[PDB]
Each structure stands twice: as C-alpha cells, then as structure tokens.
From a paper:
EG2.2s had acquired a non-synonymous substitution in sad, resulting in an amino acid change of Q262R; while EG2.3a, EG2.4a, and EG2.5a were predicted by the breseq pipeline28 to carry amplified genomic regions that encoded sad (~80×). To understand the molecular basis of the improved enzyme activity in the Q262R variant, we solved the crystal structures of both Sad WT and Q262R variants with bound NAD+, as well as in complex with both NAD+ and SSA. While we were not able to obtain structures with sufficient electron densities for the alternative sugar-phosphate substrates, we manually fitted E4P and GAP based on the NAD+/SSA-bound structures. Potential interactions for the coordination of SSA are shown as black dashed lines and important distances are given in Å. f, g The active site of the Q262R variant of Sad with bound NAD+ and modeled E4P & GAP (based on the position of SSA in the Q262R variant, taking into account available space and potential coordinating residues). R262 is likely responsible for an improved coordination of the phosphate group of E4P and GAP. Moreover, in the Q262R variant, E4P dehydrogenase activity was increased 17-fold compared to the WT, reaching 800 nmol min−1 mg−1. Further kinetic investigations revealed that the Q262R substitution had significantly improved the Km of Sad for sugar phosphates. Km, its affinities toward E4P and GAP were increased by 75- and 16-fold, respectively. This improved the catalytic efficiency of the reaction with E4P and GAP by two orders of magnitude, reaching kcat/Km-values that fall in the range of enzymes on their native substrates (103−108 s−1 M−1). In contrast, in the EG2.2s strain that harbored the Sad Q262R variant, the Sad expression level was unchanged, supporting the finding that the single amino acid substitution was sufficient to increase E4P dehydrogenase flux.
The NAD(P)+-dependent succinate semialdehyde dehydrogenase (SSADH) Sad is a member of the ALDH superfamily and oxidizes succinate semialdehyde (SSA) to succinate. In microorganisms, SSADHs operate in the degradation of various nitrogen-containing compounds such as putrescine or arginine, where they prevent the accumulation of the toxic SSA intermediate. Our results show that Sad is a surprisingly flexible enzyme that is not only able to detoxify succinate semialdehyde and glutarate semialdehyde but can also functionally substitute erythrose 4-phosphate dehydrogenase in pyridoxal 5′-phosphate (PLP) biosynthesis and glyceraldehyde 3-phosphate dehydrogenase (as well as phosphoglycerate kinase) in glycolysis under physiological conditions. We show that Sad, which primarily functions in the detoxification of succinate semialdehyde in various degradation pathways, does not only accept closely related substrates, but also converts phosphorylated sugars as a side reactivity.
Residue numbers in the entry:
A (entry chain B), B (entry chain A): 3 to 462
Write the structure that this text describes.
Amino acid sequence: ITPATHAISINPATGEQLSVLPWAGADDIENALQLAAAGFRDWRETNIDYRAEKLRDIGKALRARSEEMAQMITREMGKPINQARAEVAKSANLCDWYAEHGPAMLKAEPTLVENQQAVIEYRPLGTILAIMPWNFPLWQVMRGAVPIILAGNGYLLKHAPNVMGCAQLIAQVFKDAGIPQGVYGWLNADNDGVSQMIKDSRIAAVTVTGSVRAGAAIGAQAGAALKKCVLELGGSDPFIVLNDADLELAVKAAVAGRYRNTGQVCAAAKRFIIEEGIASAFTERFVAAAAALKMGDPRDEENALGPMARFDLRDELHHQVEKTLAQGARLLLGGEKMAGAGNYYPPTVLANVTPEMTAFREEMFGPVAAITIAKDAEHALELANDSEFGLSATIFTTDETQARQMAARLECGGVFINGYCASDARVAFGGVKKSGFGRELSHFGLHEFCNIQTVWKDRI
Amino acid sequence: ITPATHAISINPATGEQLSVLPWAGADDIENALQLAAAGFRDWRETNIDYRAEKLRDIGKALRARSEEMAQMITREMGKPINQARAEVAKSANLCDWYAEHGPAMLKAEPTLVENQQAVIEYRPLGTILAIMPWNFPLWQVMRGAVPIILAGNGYLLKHAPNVMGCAQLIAQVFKDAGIPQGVYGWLNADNDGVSQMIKDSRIAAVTVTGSVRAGAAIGAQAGAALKKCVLELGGSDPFIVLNDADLELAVKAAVAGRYRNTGQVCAAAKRFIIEEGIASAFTERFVAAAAALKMGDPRDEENALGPMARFDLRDELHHQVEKTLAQGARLLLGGEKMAGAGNYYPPTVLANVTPEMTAFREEMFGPVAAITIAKDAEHALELANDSEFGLSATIFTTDETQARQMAARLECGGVFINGYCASDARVAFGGVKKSGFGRELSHFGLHEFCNIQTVWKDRI
Ligand SMILES: NC(=O)c1ccc[n+]([C@@H]2O[C@H](COP(=O)([O-])OP(=O)(O)OC[C@H]3O[C@@H](n4cnc5c(N)ncnc54)[C@H](O)[C@@H]3O)[C@@H](O)[C@H]2O)c1
Ligand SMILES: NC(=O)c1ccc[n+]([C@@H]2O[C@H](COP(=O)([O-])OP(=O)(O)OC[C@H]3O[C@@H](n4cnc5c(N)ncnc54)[C@H](O)[C@@H]3O)[C@@H](O)[C@H]2O)c1
C-alpha cells in the first residue's frame, strides 16, 4: 500500500494507519459522471422551495451525526475536538442559513428595458467538480456544496486523500438527508482522474481550494477545457498593528488568528506588521500569550492546538523556519519538531523578519508567527501589500479614518478592522493575486455557478 | 512584410492591401505595461462621478469621429456602412448609459451582519488585458472597456491583426476624451507577446472574444497564471419557430438574425429549427427573403450585405458548406464563392440539415442559414440544445407559457421570445458550454473585474 496507488489516512497524533482506499478506476469515474448527469437533469427541474427544504434536511442529518463527524475530523487530521465540533455546527448552520436566505437571491431580476420586456434569470449550470483540502474537511465541502446544490447544480467532490473517512461520512450525511443520487457525489480520483473529468462534457465548472500549485495546475486545465473555475489558494494575510491600537484586543485577535486550527488556515494571520512604537510591547505580549497555549492530544479539550495534519508538511514548515533563521530572523519561541510519534510542532514566533525572508514570502501553514517592524502606517501598508498572496487582512488602530483608508488600499478580498478575521455566510469570501479569484458565500457563492440568463420578450 | 512579422489590413471588397504594422517588440511591451501600471495607480484613486463624466467625454469624442470610424470599419472588414455607423452610435450611447447608471451599481452593499459592521465594496482589480476580434471592431472593445474603466480598472487592448486601423482610431478617440495613457492602452502584440503579458504581474485578469480555439489557448494560460478570465467564444444559436408563430415576424427576425453583419455575429441566428406543420411555409418565405438581400460594395448603402472579412474564412465557410452538402443537405440558395477580387459569399440556405452535419455542429460564421425540421416543440428544444455552443436563442410561438418553459430549459445565456436577438447595455450577455463563461453588460460587466471586498469592523 503506497500513496501512488491508494488514498491513505493516518492519525497525526499517533502515527497509526486508519484506512486505505484505491484510486477510482476508469469505470468508477464513468459511473460517477453518468449519475451526476442524470441527477442534475432531474434536480434542475425541482422547485426552489423544495431544494431549500432539502438543505434543512442536510442540516438535520449533519447534526444527528455531529459527534461522529467531529471525531472523524479530529482523528484524520488532528484538529482539537472542540474546533471540529464547531466546524460541524457552523456547517449545519450554513444549511439553514441558505435555506432561509438563498431562495430570494435566485429570484428573477427586473431590468431597465421598457414595459418589463426583459428579466435576468439565475439558471443552473450543471455538475460542479470540487477539489477540496484537509484543513476543514467538512466546512470546505459544505461552503460550496450547499449554495451550488440550492442553485440547481450537482456537486462532485474530489476530497484530499488524507480525509477520505471524512468524505465517506459526508456522503452518508447526504444519503441520510435523501439527496438524490448524482446530485451529491464523490470520487477517490488521482490527479489523472481529475484531468479526465475536467475534460468531460458532464462537468460544467470547477472549484478548487488548496495550494497555489494545485490552483495553477487545475486552473490551466479548466481554461483549456473552456470550464469556468473558482480558485481559493491560501494566503499570507497581514495583521497590522498601529501605535494607537487597543493592544490587549490586538494581541488576542493576533493569537487567535495565527494559531486557530494549529495555524492551518488560508486566512490565518500570518504576517504581523507592527508599527515601531508599539512593536516591543506587542511582541512581548504576543510571545507570552503564544507560550501559554496548551498543545497535545486533540481529543483532550484542554488543548488549544493539536498536531499538524501531515508529517511531510511539518517537515516543509520546519524547513521554512530554518531558512528564515538562516536569513537573519530571530527565534523567540518554539521552532523545533517535537520528538515522538505525533506530528507536533510547538507554537513558534520569528522576529526581525524582513520582506526578503522565506517566512515573509511563502505561506506558513502551521503555528509559526512572523513579526515585521514597520516605520509608520504607510510603511505598514507597503509591507502588507508586498506579497504574492491577497486573501484577507487585519488592521488594528483606533483611528477609524486611517483604518478605512488602508482598507481601500489593501490588496486583498477581505479587511477586518479591529476584530477577528473569519469566514461567514453573510459576507463574500475569496481573494486576489495568487490567492485566486471568484467569491464564495452570501449571494456570490450562489451565483458563481449559475447560468445568468437574459429572457427578453417582444424585442421588436 | 509577412504574416509572421506584421499585422496586415486588406480591403475585403477589393483585395487591396491597406496597411501593415509590425508586432510590438520587447521594449514596446514593457513600455505598455509600465504605462498601464502607472495609469491604474492614479486612476484607481479618482472619484466615480469624475470617471462617469469621463465616460461622457468618450461618447462625445467618439461621435465627433463617427464617420471616420465607420468608414475605417467598413474599409478594413467589409461591414455595410450603415451597420458600421450603427455600431458607432451604439458604442457612444453605451458610454452615456454607463455614465448615468454605472456609479450606483458600484456602491457598497449592506450585509445581514449585526450592527451594520460589514459591507461589500467593489474595488478595481488592476489592468485587464483584452483580446478582441474583427467582426465589431469598435463595439467589442467598448462593450468591455467602458464598464472596466468605470470600475477603476485599466484596459489594455490586443486587437485582431486585420483591424489595426480601427484600433489606432479607437486609441485616438480615448485620447481626444482625455482618458490617461495606460488607463486605456493598446499593443500590436503577437501571440507570444500576449503570453508574456498574461504572466506579468502588471496584468490582473484577461477578457477574450473570439474563436473557441483562442479561448482555450488563452484561458489555459490565464488559469496557469492564476488570472481570472472571461471568455465569449461564439455560438450556433437556435432559432425555433412553432406552428402557432407569427410567421411574417418570425421570417423577418430570422433573416435579420442570420444575415446581419454578413452573418459574422457570435449571436447570429444560425440553426433554424422549424416545427413540421409550418416548415414548408417558413422555408419558402425565408429563401425568398434571403434572395432579396442586395450584396456588394459596402460603401454603397443599397447593399444589405458586404464581402466577408477574411479570404481564408470565406474558404473555410465554403468548405463547411461543401461538407454539409456531401453529407446529405439540400442547397436552396447560394452556396458558391463569387469570382473576382472581392471576398463575396452570397446569401445561402441549406435545408434538410440533420444534427450530424457540419452546418449543425460547427459555427457557420457567414451568410449560411441551416434549416432543420422538428416533429414538435419538445423535439425542437432537444435539437436546440444539441450543440457544443450556448450563447443565445430565439423562440417564436404565440403560446407565451410554452415560450417561458422552453426558455427555462434552453442551455444558453440569452433567450428572445418573438423578437430580435441583440446585445444591450441593460441586460446580461454571454453564454455557456463552448460559448464560454462570464457575463458582460449591465452590472455584470462592471463587477466581473472587481475585487469584491468584505470590509468588517469590530468583529469581536
Ligand atoms: N487554501 C487552503 O485552504 C489550503 C488548504 C490546504 C493546503 N493549502 C496549502 O497547500 C499546501 C500543501 O498542502 P496540500 O499538499 O494538501 O495542498 P494541495 O493543493 O496539494 O491539496 C489540495 C487539493 O488539491 C488536490 N490536488 C493537488 N494537486 C492536484 C493536481 N495536480 N490535480 C488534481 N488535483 C490536485 C489534492 O488532492 C487536494 O484534494 C499547504 O501547506 C498550504 O500552504 C491551502
Ligand atoms: N465570438 C466572436 O464574436 C467571434 C469573433 C470572431 C471570430 N469568431 C470565430 O472564430 C473564427 C475565426 O476567426 P478568427 O481567426 O479571427 O478567430 P480568432 O480567435 O483567431 O481571432 C480572435 C482574436 O484572438 C486573438 N488570438 C487568437 N488566438 C490567440 C492566441 N493563441 N493568443 C493570443 N491571441 C490570440 C486574435 O489575434 C484575435 O485578436 C470565426 O470564423 C468565428 O467562428 C468568433
């Protein structure tokens, strides 16, 4: 059993092999595409209010399996159990939210054409192929699947190969809810299987959450096949603290933003950009708060951090730490792989990080904070924008006039002023630059995979 | 002078070489990108009401050169002069329409977040690279440039190599209007130059109007570079006539839809799908009406059709005609290349066209109507959707409820019921399947190239 023939689940806290699953064969892929096509054909004809009711059924079936799902998330990728439980609750609440607010967003639009001759309709597009990651194994699927299916599309999940136990449980939830065959489906396809599906006429569009490299590989294939794609490819979000900040609130938001989900968050606070006058006080408070975080067995609710999800990615992250230290940064906390069977990396703080260093230019997808000193607010904006990424950003300053101006100039898709960054059904999510393009949640996640259709009567 | 080194204009009505222009060099490309970056940096700071006034200045500058522009359009690609004049009028009115209605579409959205803490802002993305075709040398450019620039983006035009006289005149109009260099810019880039610009960080996104082959080549590169693209790649629009249609109006709309711009329209009526009871009457009327169209010198206003734009594309169209005849269709009108120096192809009607034939499966980008018989309305819908394309469609029937149900089942981005298909600033434009993805005009054209940005204050 090698990762060249199988999807493999390993518990990152213990090292034990949980499950293996061979890649989908040519028959498996063809069967899934046939059922997706048949399911979409029938699903697109359903009434919107019936689909809204089915979303609520998904929410009930998810809550009914809430602890089983949370434990599967924790077991396969190491997330603290209360964060996994929160992920389940957030995902079930998303079902109910789109059931209530989604239908109105799909109503026909009036136009300025005289005599009400023309309207805009939001029609289903087809089956959307979804390529998803391990860090929120449930929420990442539901964030797209819920509005996509509400809009009359089908959804075909290609999940990360280390969370196929989560993928099977999600399928069971959709089965429990009575979602027809082919409307929600999933496949353990290897990269070639994905390539084959992108080229297949029964896949209408593609959505990807993952690495920049995956986004570039899949986006190129989608474009070559004339398939629209949405790409969410991670981030290196700046977290700016100016001299007049509420320092106690800023440190709390800084610690939560960097170290939630053991740092494995696309929109984690990854680059702390601190104005010079407050930098010493921020750094000392931040290091002390990070050092008080309890880490260990993620089934134990006293622990705020678990192990990292993937052994090879802990090696990558530690290598990023070593290079950054070799480049001249200072190690203030952590910075060594923990011995033992678990994939643990301690909360880590690097300081004296300059724009040329590895921890400033690459996504640090684990519990490693990078602290950079800014000379003033204009330098802080320049440092914040000096990134290939552009997902989200935080600004802490009590000057509301300065905050709003920096938001208008921050090169990212979401700006949080004096608060905690998060994704939320009620607001758009997604970024710019190498973080990708397209928007999820609110009405944006509904409409991205609609056929927006002008219907015009009696144009004579 | 060779096609490997130069853009070349030839008058299709006479075969006379008009002009040549060498491809941009490395220095030209870098200068255009530097201008674009400097122009966007300043333009994004302007007030939206200022930009709206600048749109009005564009409309004024364009009308002031309306006849110079129209004659250049007709001279370079063969369009009947009054259709070229109408193209100018429609483009100038688009400037005024977006100046009046655009700014309100760019206001921040409220959200359902508590305490009015979060809004959605529509920020510009950057410089949009636009790859455009020769069939509407002005309107294709303005359709995107006007909303793109209004949203605070820059626009960098790579026009079709046979209309660089048009491209130069468009640049002069923007300069007459006082639109800064780089905010509207253009380059005579070859394909490699386009590839270099797509990879350059000073290009934020790409928009393409052209062939399926061009959209696949460019879309693949945009995806590989993590740049959003919008693709409009032509169509094979069905035109459905049921037994209860207003037959006189249906034939008029049928003829106008197929033969406008000598057939060279993405959203032309290309596949006529006629219910069996009315098929003989429709076909007789349609052949007679098409045979009454005058073709010749497009400077002479008595002509409804001109020569086709490109000699090689007349050859391609006639090859598609010959293959369709060889497969079993019946030639009712035209069907032969005219002798002489001009690139003339007569109005042509193919009957007994089945879904397996070349004229049913490929885009027929010239004055060639295909007529297919449908047994009933359900067969008509199946025939209409049996296409790799999906741009627009027409339904003629007095059963207004049947029309509405068929529209909800047509796999295309626009459906015209008992009327003339057209693009219009007030409604969405763009299709599905191999016709591409993304939407132009109305608020869609403004928002496709925005950074849709969540700004959320005090999330604590
Ligand atoms: N944006 C995010 O939420 C997110 C999530 C996980 C990882 N990441 C980033 O990616 C890095 C690596 O983690 P990863 O290896 O799991 O990321 P990954 O991109 O390799 O995995 C993401 C998903 O894309 C699929 N995938 C990757 N390459 C593919 C290809 N060529 N064809 C088809 N499918 C393909 C994977 O199977 C998985 O389902 C992390 O350190 C982090 O920086 C980002
Ligand atoms: N959608 C439309 O409105 C439209 C317009 C013109 C042509 N077409 C279709 O395309 C057929 C051929 O006409 P055409 O040869 O002018 O189409 P074309 O796609 O080759 O030309 C379209 C534009 O794209 C550019 N282009 C093409 N390939 C490119 C590449 N690889 N890299 C960079 N730029 C590239 C061309 O220079 C031109 O500016 C027509 O017969 C018709 O079927 C469609």
